[PDB]
Amino acid sequence: MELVVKSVAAASVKTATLVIPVGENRKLGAVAKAVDLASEGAISAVLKRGDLAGKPGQTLLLQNLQGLKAERVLLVGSGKDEALGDRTWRKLVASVAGVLKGLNGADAVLALDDVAVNNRDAHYGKYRLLAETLLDGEYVFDRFKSEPRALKKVTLLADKAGQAEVERAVKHASAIATGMAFTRDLGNLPPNLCHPSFLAEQAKELGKAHKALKVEVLDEKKIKDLGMGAFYAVGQGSDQPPRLIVLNYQGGKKADKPFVLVGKGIMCGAASVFGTLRAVLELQLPVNLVCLLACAENMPSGGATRPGDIVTTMSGQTVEILNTDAEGRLVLCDTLTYAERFKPQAVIDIATLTGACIVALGSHTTGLMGNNDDLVGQLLDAGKRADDRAWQLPLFDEYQEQLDSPFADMGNIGGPKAGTITAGCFLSRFAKAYNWAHMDIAGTAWISGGKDKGATGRPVPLLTQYLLDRAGA
Amino acid sequence: MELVVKSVAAASVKTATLVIPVGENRKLGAVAKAVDLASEGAISAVLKRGDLAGKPGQTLLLQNLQGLKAERVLLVGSGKDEALGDRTWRKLVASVAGVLKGLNGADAVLALDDVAVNNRDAHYGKYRLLAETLLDGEYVFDRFKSEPRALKKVTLLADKAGQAEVERAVKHASAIATGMAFTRDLGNLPPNLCHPSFLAEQAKELGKAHKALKVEVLDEKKIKDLGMGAFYAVGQGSDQPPRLIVLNYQGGKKADKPFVLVGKGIMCGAASVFGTLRAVLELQLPVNLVCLLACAENMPSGGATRPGDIVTTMSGQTVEILNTDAEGRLVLCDTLTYAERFKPQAVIDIATLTGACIVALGSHTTGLMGNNDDLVGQLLDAGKRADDRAWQLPLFDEYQEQLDSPFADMGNIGGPKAGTITAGCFLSRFAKAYNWAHMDIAGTAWISGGKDKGATGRPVPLLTQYLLDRAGA
Amino acid sequence: MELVVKSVAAASVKTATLVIPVGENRKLGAVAKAVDLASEGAISAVLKRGDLAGKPGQTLLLQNLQGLKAERVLLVGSGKDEALGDRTWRKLVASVAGVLKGLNGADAVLALDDVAVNNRDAHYGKYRLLAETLLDGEYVFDRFKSEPRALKKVTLLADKAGQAEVERAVKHASAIATGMAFTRDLGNLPPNLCHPSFLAEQAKELGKAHKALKVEVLDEKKIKDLGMGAFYAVGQGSDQPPRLIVLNYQGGKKADKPFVLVGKGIMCGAASVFGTLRAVLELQLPVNLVCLLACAENMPSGGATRPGDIVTTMSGQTVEILNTDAEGRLVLCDTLTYAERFKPQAVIDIATLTGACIVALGSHTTGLMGNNDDLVGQLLDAGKRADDRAWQLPLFDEYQEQLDSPFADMGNIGGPKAGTITAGCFLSRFAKAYNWAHMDIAGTAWISGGKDKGATGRPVPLLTQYLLDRAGA
């Protein structure tokens, strides 16, 4: 779908469908009133019949009206006068998109300037959320199913003053949504096909397509020979061997320290790193970004790791693997040591790490921990502006003893209490060299059931926003 | 909702909303084509734009069209050029009703004569299903919540020849839907209000309202004094005492044997008997119908029955109560002995009796067992014609040993194998005096939830259809 | 054991043991009275002492009596005058066989003509059940244990009119019992020894021994190369590879369409196919019978299929393998596609498929589903005449949605409700090309515990009866 911005009057634009908002009590803002007047009162005449109460997202679709150049006018409820919160605004946009998807119209014009969104400026933040909802909602994953939609273009109308800010919002939302689609395809792919070697092929192909990107893949023997005893212990059980994939984007000055993203690829952590990199390549951000994808397949077999095994991590710390299903933190901890070589200014790991995070923060909010208050605050602020929120949990020292082992430097589990925090605590012991934060996306990376089951693409908006903020874009 | 039938031309009829069907490829049957012609090709013109693909239940709502008397036209998809099955036809009607309930029109006209429904005649069977779906779909249970709908009347258009048969379908569906509303309200009432004494007061109120109905309520001491040891044992643990409620409707000839319906009232079995009785009263069927509601509340306490207790049933047979959660069969078996006094031609018990029936037949199909093939077959056929299906399970003699007790004449459980059948087998030992069937509605009596959730109307259409069949209506 | 039929008088026959029935109240039928008279009243004299009450199966064994040529006379209770049901009649026959097994007599004569069996003619159906019980009860499986019985021959006496029908019963029961023994040996063999390659060797050996039989075995690579993605996914986890074994018996006319039996061989479904084929070869039935044994071993390992895998079946439909323990339907669905090539007049799959069938129909009755009402009725009638009963469950379309997947054409599980039906529903989607039925023998193929633990040989009597019915034998 092409997204464009114009500043011409809504009533003047030739289009298959013009979309205008209508509030409760059939209240029309200035944009809607101008279109009603161009229609000689035809829109207000239908509204007086009472079929559209105006609650957010309710719709009434009209056919060809004399006086307008639109073939159809879609009226969409904007609710009470109050400014809308982010969820209501995105639900209104998705309700519009739903109707448009079902029509045989080749384009549409959205004339929603009058809709206020709480705490967001009328041109950039409001349209960041509309454009991301509109483009992410085009996603289809029908590869394994045994009809192309008519809608190819949407025009957003804004006043001439606000045009460049709406265009900037569209540019950034398009990059985010393209990244998200990549993340959602990799997550949705079934595990027979999406294994560590497939991810390594996807990264080598992405490297060949981008000048400023260099890709290295470390295979099982290299992981073992680097001393990555925890990462090797997770992968050994499977016939599909592990891969540590490095993707190094040099978009900054040569002596700028890079941002490092570490993704758990057992694999929506790794997928969100690929998606954020794809967004950064689209935007050509002027940062140095090193992506480390820690990929393995955790399977039972006659050569698998067994509860009670003790391994030497790359750092030299030993770990008692009490539970082989606490495996993400094992491939992560060796990859955090590996990240030291880049001399980074921030290292952020993203992982579907704990069922306990779903108990603490559910499906709405990603769990965030770290060793640096400024980096944690930057990620929280990014999530608020991107509408991809996180929330900090504490790594107080009192939780660390839960990982003590009588035999090794630490165990990999902390017991039933504070499970998201003790996993963060485990990882912190490998992150002391640099400013680090950990994002547990076990609750926000996918939808379990319904027809909406499948990957969400989170946290590509928060990560891409954080890197826009560091680039000063 | 008032529901009436007319045989006037659709384009001629004054109404807030006219509903007509459109097939795939914008194909119009005779009725729709006539309204298109009256509209001066307005309906075809909009169809050519392609917003309505015409899959079953899809919709497109038009406003005032020149040449018609209807204020609005709703187009609804009827699919390809082949007859619909019951489920698809009922879903189409519910789609139409959903749109109408959201509009501010005080009436609507359905002109859906051209839609064929597989194995249902165009006047009676087709409209039994439409009218019940429409009328049951109006149900609201908002009494415990802290806006009435505009739609007050629907007119169905049929040709002059079929009018009386559509009217007879509306008469029968209206009685069924009014019975189902009563059933659903009693099921959805919470248990601190809907206890056995409440149901006794419901029955006594119904007895006052109706001439041919006599109601007697037997209290705990009566049940104990009649020797109903198994029914007494279920109720004794609660502070709410049990009631056996008798409602006797003498609509037949004096010497005609009655049909007896026995409902488990622990309580949707008993509620479906109340709702079938309310439909029979509305229809004034010329049958003798005796309803026996076996009502108790099964609670833990210091005076409750305890696993291993042995009781003497009214029949004199002893039962070892191995599980106190197999309680519905205990109140039922004594009520089946009580039913012998009526010298019935059929005794049907209805009960939410086994989780095993949900494992066997799920949410769609009621489990059915009996001692008389003709009666079982009459109930199956009634279910097919009412679109409230059941399915027989065998009461082979080989299952009876699973009830053996070393101490008593039987135990009340049969173990983990064949649990719906062994409950039927237990009840069959009390039904040998008469032609008997048992309906296990544990899967079909409510939605659980889902996200929209509550009692079904489910016993009522089959049972009402069986009594229309016996009354030769 | 040799089974023969004669029509001479019971008292005249030289034998180690003559067996006669005695009813309650010491009532003697005409055959028993004639033997009493030949013994000069010695049998009635012992009976007046009261040790034998005559309940079915009770026994009294006499020694050498003057006047008879039998060395011993066994009196067996036949109960009250009523005709016996099938179970009681078979239990009486097994009680006789029990005594005979313990004696050092080389032969025995059964003179049980007077015993009536409910709904069975005195010569064919009555003796079908006696002869099958007598010969199946000879079964021994002592291969893995670290004494040969004296009884080598039994003569059944009947009147000369009925001799040829009793002989026909014996011929058909012997074929069934021989088939059953083969089925019971393959089921009883332990899984270390009985793996898919062993079954393939058993089928190639059976092919070499029968002129009208051709055997082909498809190995793992052939299964994969045919596109059988579901069958290959089940077997891949194990070190023992899968086999699809084809056994084609051409006993009919060349242009007669064959009957196809599909057996799950994970393996009593496959075993019952081998046993039914062995019975058909013994009888030289004039039908074309193609047997397809879908054999694999379902094991965990580092290369096993994992919940969430998506595979392409031979048909091109894709399946999401939600649960790797729903594996029978996976090897079956690709074998049902394979069966299309034979252009069959009936395809029947037999499988130990669901624990839910044991909840629905227990150990007594096999679950039956299909897409053709005539074939389902034929199998039900066969099971009633063979005393190997089945019972139909419905494949209503409403159960099909339980298999929907958001990613693939279907999932392989339907949830906790209606599990036997949803497995049938899954299979039906691969059976549309032909008349098909599915037999779930999870409850009837073996006895779990006791000393009687082990395979039953069911449903070889129902399947062999169905093929006798189609041959017109």
mmCIF file of C-alpha atoms in Angstrom, chain A residues 17 46 48-52 55 60-64 71-72 102-105 147, chain B residues 46 48-53 55 60-64 71-72 102-105 147:
data_model
loop_
_atom_site.group_PDB
_atom_site.id
_atom_site.type_symbol
_atom_site.label_atom_id
_atom_site.label_comp_id
_atom_site.label_asym_id
_atom_site.label_seq_id
_atom_site.Cartn_x
_atom_site.Cartn_y
_atom_site.Cartn_z
ATOM 1 C CA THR A 17 -13.674 6.469 -0.837
ATOM 2 C CA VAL A 46 -28.499 10.947 6.540
ATOM 3 C CA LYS A 48 -30.341 13.010 11.280
ATOM 4 C CA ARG A 49 -31.925 9.597 10.512
ATOM 5 C CA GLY A 50 -29.924 8.243 13.463
ATOM 6 C CA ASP A 51 -28.231 5.097 12.165
ATOM 7 C CA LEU A 52 -24.717 6.220 13.283
ATOM 8 C CA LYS A 55 -19.092 5.754 19.070
ATOM 9 C CA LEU A 60 -21.842 4.393 7.907
ATOM 10 C CA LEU A 61 -20.955 4.019 4.222
ATOM 11 C CA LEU A 62 -22.510 6.233 1.572
ATOM 12 C CA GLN A 63 -22.634 5.963 -2.131
ATOM 13 C CA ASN A 64 -22.014 8.581 -4.855
ATOM 14 C CA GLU A 71 -17.293 7.704 -5.258
ATOM 15 C CA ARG A 72 -18.214 6.668 -1.674
ATOM 16 C CA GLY A 102 -13.646 -5.229 1.784
ATOM 17 C CA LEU A 103 -14.412 -2.662 -0.915
ATOM 18 C CA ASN A 104 -13.370 -2.775 -4.544
ATOM 19 C CA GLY A 105 -11.901 0.721 -4.324
ATOM 20 C CA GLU A 147 -7.484 -12.631 -2.878
ATOM 21 C CA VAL B 46 -24.084 -0.064 -6.493
ATOM 22 C CA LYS B 48 -21.274 -3.184 -9.918
ATOM 23 C CA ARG B 49 -18.830 -1.256 -7.665
ATOM 24 C CA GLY B 50 -18.060 -4.609 -5.953
ATOM 25 C CA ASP B 51 -18.282 -3.833 -2.256
ATOM 26 C CA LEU B 52 -20.566 -6.785 -1.669
ATOM 27 C CA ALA B 53 -19.095 -10.122 -2.751
ATOM 28 C CA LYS B 55 -20.932 -14.559 0.486
ATOM 29 C CA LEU B 60 -24.372 -3.613 2.319
ATOM 30 C CA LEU B 61 -26.753 -1.008 3.659
ATOM 31 C CA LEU B 62 -28.337 1.615 1.384
ATOM 32 C CA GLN B 63 -30.218 4.775 2.266
ATOM 33 C CA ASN B 64 -33.362 6.249 0.617
ATOM 34 C CA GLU B 71 -36.217 4.221 3.932
ATOM 35 C CA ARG B 72 -33.209 1.906 3.771
ATOM 36 C CA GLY B 102 -28.039 -1.302 15.555
ATOM 37 C CA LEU B 103 -30.242 0.902 13.416
ATOM 38 C CA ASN B 104 -32.910 3.370 14.599
ATOM 39 C CA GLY B 105 -35.692 1.819 12.490
ATOM 40 C CA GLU B 147 -30.820 0.989 25.791
#
